[PDB]
């Protein structure tokens, strides 16, 4: 019925299409156990959401570099920001783990005991941390515009859109790393080269990806 | 009982002669989905009608102005004296604004048939629009729609399909030989054997790129011909 | 005059990790699990003694061929 | 005839592919298509294939490597040629002219083999015996005639 | 293997007649190794896969046999430029033997497009063998209408693969399948002839034919052992 | 997957992982603090 990653192959039993972005792709049966599948569903969303922020940030700053606004490449921004602004790297790293540790520990114990973070313990907030589904916090803090509290049909459509752009972003972030390692240039520097001579400038001719070439 | 594209070939079930110029030809089976068939039918009309204007323009333009070489007519310096070296950016602005309005109106008709018949500004004006893709009314001032409309639709699509094939012949011939349609026809008559596709097919006469008022525009041939 | 020919059986066994989690499955004696430490040594000693797991020559030959 | 670490590296990669093939075969012939008992009991057929097919063709195939790769490479190595300047094994295979210089018998192609003028190949199919004085090991030309006879 | 036509070929044996009953195309009883015996079959050695594989080998070989000699014949007749009059093994498939510079891309760039294109063509073809009719169900841009198969993997039929629905009658279809198999088997031997002749002589298939006709006695396999 | 994780919980598999971890920790400590003889 519903489309699958490999046309003609029946989907796995444990993937019934209820989840967003379900194409029955689980060749290694990593999520056969129902409780483990909940953990990975949220792991995919967190991975996808971070990748979308990463890809958008890398793309935008790369446009700034090409246009000449002075932005550094994503693989040099860390060094430039610290030196130019005179920031102690170990202090910045520690601050990150306090803020991430607090925010991400709360997400951890909401997964273990759903609704536990909405008991008013944290500064008296009792409804912004209740959670709607697994991986979808909802609420008037994480969803201020209430797009998850309006139409039910369109909210399900967005869940499909979120996961697929997340998976695409995850692949893109792997492309940025692989392209930098093979080429040593920025993302849009590679795109400009390909558009110049697509036939003679690509991975099959970089001298790295296909060593036998 | 109608004749089909090939002898002794069974027509698809969904092609039963309802549409004009129906030979039961669909090897890829792209018309299986009824909703998709409607959309593809509209695009056939758009290509058919635009192509016929394209063929007529090239041929008539060649007769009136032999030297313009329509393939290069797009360059601003080759425009007529009143419009010579006009700013292409402003020229494109007119087309985008005007075509966006016209085409969205046509598109909205497809999405919701009969919704956009009436004039938006002057209330009262309307077009009959008997069938999708055939607005009629003000679009048919001479009233040829009256009468055997089915036959006229057949004539339109058959000529339109021929124009589509004919125009892409102009493009490939210009790319390979560097001459317009009529000019290439004269060349073949002069030396039918020495000058034909067997010799010209291996060369592409289109430069890699052109500079239009400081903006570089990539160009290509439709095959990897020997530049 | 039995002809020389290729002869196989289709899908004789199922590929599952179920028996990987049940030590001693191959032998009737050890399948019940351990009660003394002697069971552990018996598991490794008789693992490849195919001829004693089953009395079927065909089953023995197939294990030898894949081993 | 191995002269570079690239040649060693490729064999290792081929070794892993063979290792994967061997484990697939074991799984395939137990869980998917297991031979029946009557198949295992064709001792006459097994000996025929293992005598002429395993040992026989294996010896012939290795003779092909020695005649075309080991003998030319080791002839130049013993002469003192720098290993990096020796022709690659495929150049020796594709260019009969190079082989003719080392062994003139190659100038006649395979006609002597089919015309039974086997004495033409005396230059690389030898029966010297003893040890090669330069390297202290058996003549490879003797070893090639050994595996051709075997 | 008896050449030409006959009820049975040289290698036909009473053992092979047990299961070879003429149902398959080109069933001349030739199976000395008895690989098509249904009894206790499995894996890839079974009638359905072996018969399917022969047809697939036949069709690739037919394209290869005609494509490995056409450049030489057309080049010899002057219909293509001499720059493309290239031996089949010097096109670039085996760079050590010879490579052609002048393709629109590096031969490895072209290969990647070949990988992606053949992944779709071959894996979709496979899925129809594993799950008959399964490729006509999931959306594929409306093209699934022509991928419904016909129950027999080697003969999909349908609106595209049977564009002109030849062999409408059962008797006619059997003759066409027989003609396909015999031409396919002949082409498979021809391709093996090209490979063996290339190594022995180092020249193209067309050159070998011309030389043989010149002096048939002085040009043949026996004389090519030495040069 | 339940059975596979059960197989990884068998005594030989646990010991291999546990000693591989334990050995790695000791090896790494001696890599960054070479030649420890006295607490100091
Ligand atoms: C039916 C429409 C139409 C056709 C068939 C042509 C055909 C041609 N024009 Mg002409 N033009 C057309 C409309 C127009 N032209 C021009 C202005 C020019 C100029 C200035 C030039 C041409 C030239 C050319 C040639 C281009 C060769 C090529 O590979 O280009 C295709 C190359 C591309 C890079 C584009 C290919 C894709 C596609 C056609 C464009 C799609 C763009 C999207 C809408 C962008 C969307 C962006 C997203 C982010 C929203 C060819 C003879 C050139 C010429 O004469 O060369 C000798 C030339 O210099 N044309 C204008 C502005 C008034 C047009 C307006 O409609
Ligand atoms: C016995 C001690 C004790 C321990 C070990 C913990 C441990 C924890 N509590 Mg805590 N609690 C403890 C006692 C108590 N807690 C609470 C009430 C709570 C609540 C309500 C919550 C926790 C949470 C947490 C976790 C925070 C994880 C993290 O990364 O924080 C990172 C730590 C910080 C961001 C704060 C500390 C930062 C830094 C060390 C001090 C900086 C001070 C400066 C003034 C900063 C100024 C900067 C400005 C100017 C820019 C963690 C497991 C949170 C959690 O994860 O719940 C699931 C949570 O929500 N605890 C109470 C009151 C009843 C306690 C009473 O004894
Ligand atoms: C998780 C994703 C992520 C991460 C780790 C970074 C990290 C970084 N970004 Mg990027 N960025 C991202 C997403 C991300 N960005 C997105 C989604 C966008 C919008 C499309 C941008 C737009 C952006 C701009 C326009 C700039 C950066 C810059 C920076 C650098 C300094 C950040 C700073 O000082 O913030 C401090 C900010 C706050 C405390 C307020 C929040 C740093 C390397 C700066 C840079 O590269 O400078 C050289 C810079 O100018 N980012
Ligand atoms: C299987 C068909 C085939 C293939 C794969 C190639 C491949 C190639 N040809 Mg060749 N060619 C062919 C057939 C083919 N040719 C035929 C039949 C002719 C006679 C018309 C030519 C005439 C020809 C010329 C004059 C040149 C090439 C060249 C080339 C190169 C590409 C660049 C180019 O300009 O091509 C252009 C070639 C074509 C567009 C031919 C397309 C043929 C299609 C694929 C097959 C169907 C044709 C059909 C029967 C109609 C024929 C004409 C019609 C009027 C009867 C490349 C090596 C160029 C070269 O040598 O570069 C160094 C070059 O200059 N070819
Ligand atoms: C992942 C694939 C897979 C799976 C799930 C199964 C599943 C099964 N197999 Mg099959 N099998 C496979 C692959 C697989 N097999 C392969 C690749 C082969 C070819 C060798 C075989 C050959 C085979 C045979 C011949 C038999 C089975 C049997 C079984 C059953 C029990 C197996 C068991 O208890 O293993 C648990 C065992 C282990 C984890 C030991 C692993 C041993 C391998 C070879 C590694 C050896 C490492 C070596 C000792 C290293 C040196 C050690 C030193 C450093 C200390 C079960 C249905 C048995 C059966 O059906 O009995 C009724 C049976 O007789 N299998
Ligand atoms: C198994 C061992 C073996 C092998 C593989 C070879 C191989 C070779 N020997 Mg050697 N040789 C051997 C043993 C071997 N030899 C032994 C034991 C002796 C001692 C008697 C010799 C003595 C000897 C001499 C004296 C010579 C060779 C030569 C050769 C080369 C050419 C032979 C020839 O003319 O073939 C003729 C034709 C064939 C072998 C048939 C080829 C069939 C092809 C592969 C079919 C491909 C079909 C396929 C469908 C097409 C591709 C399609 C695809 C791309 C789509 C060749 C590399 C000659 C040479 O060039 O030396 C440098 C040479 O002069 N050999
Ligand atoms: C000890 C080795 C061995 C033996 C005795 C067998 C025996 C058998 N296998 Mg198994 N198999 C083996 C290894 C072995 N296999 C390995 C290593 C693999 C993994 C690659 C497989 C994969 C495999 C499959 C997938 C299948 C079998 C099948 C079979 C059966 C028929 C075999 C046949 O007729 O082949 C005749 C051989 C051919 C038709 C192919 C010849 C060409 C091959 C591909 C390459 C041979 C290379 C050659 C030895 C060296 C060339 C040198 C040089 C020119 C490069 C039979 C029970 C079939 C079965 O179950 O049938 C009921 C079956 O479907 N085997
Ligand atoms: C298995 C089949 C096969 C394969 C793999 C090859 C492979 C090759 N052939 Mg051979 N060939 C074959 C069969 C094959 N041939 C057959 C059967 C014939 C006889 C008809 C020929 C005749 C032939 C000739 C005459 C020549 C080759 C050449 C070549 C080489 C270049 C290919 C090339 O440039 O294609 C070009 C690519 C295409 C034709 C495909 C175009 C793909 C685009 C995307 C299609 C776009 C379509 C468009 C949008 C709509 C339709 C337009 C149309 C109506 C005008 C290459 C080694 C050439 C060579 O050796 O050069 C050195 C050469 O000159 N072949
Ligand atoms: C009776 C047995 C015995 C004892 C007491 C020691 C003691 C020691 N050996 Mg020796 N050794 C032994 C047997 C023994 N060895 C044997 C059998 C061998 C042969 C395999 C060796 C081979 C050997 C080598 C090759 C080396 C030692 C070294 C050491 C030192 C390791 C200190 C260390 O890792 O701190 C690490 C610090 C820790 C705190 C480790 C514990 C970590 C936990 C988590 C702490 C938890 C605290 C609450 C220490 C003096 C090293 C050395 O430099 O000695 C002078 C050294 O290089 N030993
Ligand atoms: C619109 C068009 C051309 C338009 C041209 C225009 C406006 C030209 C304008 C100008 O030139 C002038 C006048 C003067 C110049 O100075 C400037 C320009 C601007 C250049 C052509 C379409 C041309 C369209 C073509 C050729 C389409 C062909 C489609 C075919 C054959 C499809 C076949 C099948 O799809 C079916 C139907 C069913 C399936 O089952 C099977 C298959 C086989 C897939």
Swiss-Prot record, chain C:
Compartments (UniProt record): Plastid, Chloroplast thylakoid membrane
UniProt family annotation: Belongs to the PsaA/PsaB family.
Function: PsaA and PsaB bind P700, the primary electron donor of photosystem I (PSI), as well as the electron acceptors A0, A1 and FX. PSI is a plastocyanin/cytochrome c6-ferredoxin oxidoreductase, converting photonic excitation into a charge separation, which transfers an electron from the donor P700 chlorophyll pair to the spectroscopically characterized acceptors A0, A1, FX, FA and FB in turn. Oxidized P700 is reduced on the lumenal side of the thylakoid membrane by plastocyanin or cytochrome c6.
Assembly notes: The PsaA/B heterodimer binds the P700 chlorophyll special pair and subsequent electron acceptors. PSI consists of a core antenna complex that captures photons, and an electron transfer chain that converts photonic excitation into a charge separation. The eukaryotic PSI reaction center is composed of at least 11 subunits.
Protein name (record): Photosystem I P700 chlorophyll a apoprotein A1
UniProt organism field: Chlamydomonas reinhardtii
UniProt lineage: Eukaryota, Viridiplantae, Chlorophyta, core chlorophytes, Chlorophyceae
Range of the intact protein held here: 10 to 76 of 751
Swiss-Prot record, chain F:
GO cellular component, one term: chloroplast thylakoid membrane
Topological category with respect to the lipid bilayer: Single-pass membrane protein
Major localisation: plastid
Signal peptide bounds: none
Compartments (UniProt record): Plastid, Chloroplast thylakoid membrane
Keywords in alphabetical order: Chloroplast, Membrane, Photosynthesis, Photosystem I, Plastid, Thylakoid, Transmembrane, Transmembrane helix
Transmembrane segments: 7-27
Covalent S-S links between cysteines: none
GO annotation terms (biological process): photosynthesis
Keyword Ribonucleoprotein recorded: no
Claim: Thylakoid is one of the keywords in the record: yes
Database matches in Pfam families: PSI_PsaJ (PF01701)
Recorded family membership: Belongs to the PsaJ family.
Function, as annotated: May help in the organization of the PsaE and PsaF subunits.
Name the record gives this protein: Photosystem I reaction center subunit IX
Taxonomic source organism: Chlamydomonas reinhardtii (Chlamydomonas smithii)
Underlying gene: psaJ
